[PDB]
């Protein structure tokens, strides 16, 4: 029954940075890891811009206590370009790297041999089998799924995924952590896409196909879903927000797992934007352009 205090987050992208932010904002020590020192600097800078907003809401009439919160949270976030030299002693490792099974497995097979025994390994994957990633180590009882939602500082949901090997103890800890993070945990079975993604991704593709079919423009499709279904964002806005590259990897993943399923049929327009390095908000341009 380990209490999570020291957290290691691998990947300082859209999800990783946010996870680190929230983890730090709620009094946990965090070590954010990524490829280069430039990347980290960018992630850390992003986490700050995100904290300024969270600032106006918790400390509006208090500018002094405003900076305090921001400085302290950034301070509780250490950075490193070497995972192995950080996970030697950590309470939990939350992986948030490229959506690719092979790459994730290699990373965990490696860290498994460095991290202390009590350490717990968690994948924030959107569409992969926790069991498949977990069986890349010899710590499956301490391996599980811990899925966050973009933007991590806003979305309250966290899907805690147990594999048939995950221990109750591992589970409970991750549950407590989720609540310590001020999030709402929901235990899910280890099925592709879990809940939210299994239902949101297929829907996002369809909206693309409706566009590819020639029946409507992206703008009207977005307007329609927001004013008609009350959705926060149109399906194309959301795609761009989440990242076209990430969406593609998810879909290509499910496609291999079952090519006959017409619901995993990859999109030409999506693949073309990715091949042109237009991943949405990330690169400054996806279906839409951003300044």
Ligand X SMILES: CC(=O)CC(=O)SCCNC(=O)CCNC(=O)[C@H](O)C(C)(C)COP(=O)(O)OP(=O)(O)OC[C@H]1O[C@@H](n2cnc3c(N)ncnc32)[C@H](O)[C@@H]1OP(=O)(O)O
Residues annotated in a binding site for NAD(+): 11-16, 34, 99, 104, 126, 150, 282
Distance from the first to the final alpha carbon of the chain: 47
- For the bound state, the minimum distance from the C-beta of residue 114 to ligand X, rounded and expressed in Å, comes to 27
Hunting for tokens 């290509």 — which residue is that? 252
Structure-token pair, residue 249 = 């990897």
- For the bound state, the minimum distance from the C-beta of residue 42 to ligand NAD, rounded and expressed in Å, comes to 8
Asked if residue 155 binds a second copy (CB under 8 A), the reply is yes
Mark 1-38 as b/e (b = at least 16 C-beta within 10 Å).
Answer: ebebebbbbbbbbbbbbbbbbbbbbeebbbbbbbeeee
Is the Cα torsion angle 238, 239, 241, 246 positive or negative in sign? Answer: positive
Is the Cα torsion angle 144, 149, 151, 152 positive or negative in sign? Answer: negative
Q: Which helix (H) or strand (E) holds 33?
A: strand 29-33
Asked if residue 149 binds a second copy (CB under 8 A), the reply is yes
Cis peptide bond N-terminal to 151, omega within 30:
yes
Nearer to ligand X, 2 or 195 (CB): 195
Q: Which region among 7-15, 198-206, 228-236, 258-266 touches ligand NAD (by CB under 6 A)?
A: 7-15
Q: Compute the distance between CA of residue 241 and CA of residue 255 in angstroms, rounded to an integer.
A: 23
184 with 246: CB under 8 angstroms?
Answer: no
Of 4, 16, 205, 270, the one binding ligand NAD (CB under 6 A) is 16
263 with 205: CB under 8 angstroms?
Answer: yes
Asked if residue 265 binds a second copy (CB under 8 A), the reply is no
- For the bound state, the minimum distance from the C-beta of residue 280 to ligand X, rounded and expressed in Å, comes to 11
Q: Compute the distance between CA of residue 234 and CA of residue 222 in angstroms, rounded to an integer.
A: 4
Binding partner selected for residue 12 from a second copy, ligand X, ligand NAD, none, CB under the kind-specific 5 to 8 Å limit: ligand NAD
Q: What is the contact mask toward ligand X in residues 133 to 172, using x (rule: CB under 6 A)?
A: ----------------xxx-xxx-----------------
- For the bound state, the minimum distance from the C-beta of residue 244 to ligand X, rounded and expressed in Å, comes to 11
Binding partner selected for residue 50 from ligand X, ligand NAD, a second copy, none, CB under the kind-specific 5 to 8 Å limit: ligand X
Nearer to a second copy, 3 or 230 (CB): 230
87 with 119: CB under 8 angstroms?
Answer: yes
**Which CA distances in Å does 288 have to 135, 138, 214, 243?**
39, 44, 18, 12
Known binding-site residues equal 11-16, 34, 50, 57, 99, 104, 126, 150, 282
Nearer to ligand X, 208 or 250 (CB): 250
Asked if residue 228 binds a second copy (CB under 8 A), the reply is yes
Kindly list the residues in this chain that would bind a second copy in the complex (CB under 8 A): 149, 155-157, 159, 184, 186-189, 191, 195-196, 198-200, 202-203, 206-207, 210, 213, 215-216, 220-221, 223-225, 227-233, 235, 261-263
Q: Which residues bind ligand X (CB under 6 A)?
A: 50, 53-54, 57, 126, 149-151, 153-155, 196-197, 200-201, 228-230, 232-233, 238, 242, 250
């Amino acid at each position: 029954k380990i209490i999570v205090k020291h957290v290691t987050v691998i990947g300082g992208g859209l999800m990783g940075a946010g996870i680190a932010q929230v983890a730090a904002a709620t009094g946990h020590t965090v070590v954010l890891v990524d490829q280069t020192e430039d990347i980290l600097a960018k992630s850390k800078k992003g986490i700050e811009e995100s904290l300024r907003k969270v600032a106006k809401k918790k400390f509006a009439e208090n500018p002094k206590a405003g900076d305090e919160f921001v400085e302290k949270t950034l301070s509780t976030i250490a950075t490193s370009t070497d995972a192995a030299s950080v996970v030697h002693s950590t309470d939990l490792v939350v992986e948030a790297i490229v959506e690719n099974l092979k790459v994730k497995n290699e990373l965990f097979k490696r860290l498994d041999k460095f991290a202390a025994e009590h350490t717990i390994f968690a994948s924030n994957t959107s569409s992969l089998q926790i069991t498949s990633i977990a069986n890349a180590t010899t710590r499956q009882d301490r391996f599980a799924g811990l899925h966050f939602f973009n933007p991590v500082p806003v979305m309250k949901l966290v899907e805690v995924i147990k594999t048939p090997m995950t221990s109750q103890k591992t589970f409970e800890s991750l549950v407590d952590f989720s609540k310590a993070l001020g999030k709402h945990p929901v235990s899910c079975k280890d099925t592709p896409g879990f809940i939210v993604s299994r239902l949101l991704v297929p829907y996002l593709m369809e909206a693309i196909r409706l566009y590819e079919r020639g029946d409507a423009s992206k703008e009207d499709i977005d307007t329609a879903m927001k004013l008609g279904a009350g959705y926060p964002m149109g399906p194309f806005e959301l795609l761009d927000y989440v990242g076209l590259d990430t969406t593609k990897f998810i879909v290509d993943g499910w496609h291999e797992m079952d090519a006959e399923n017409p619901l995993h049929q990859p999109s030409p327009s999506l693949n073309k934007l990715v091949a042109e390095n237009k991943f949405g908000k990330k690169t400054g341009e996806g279906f839409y352009k951003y300044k």
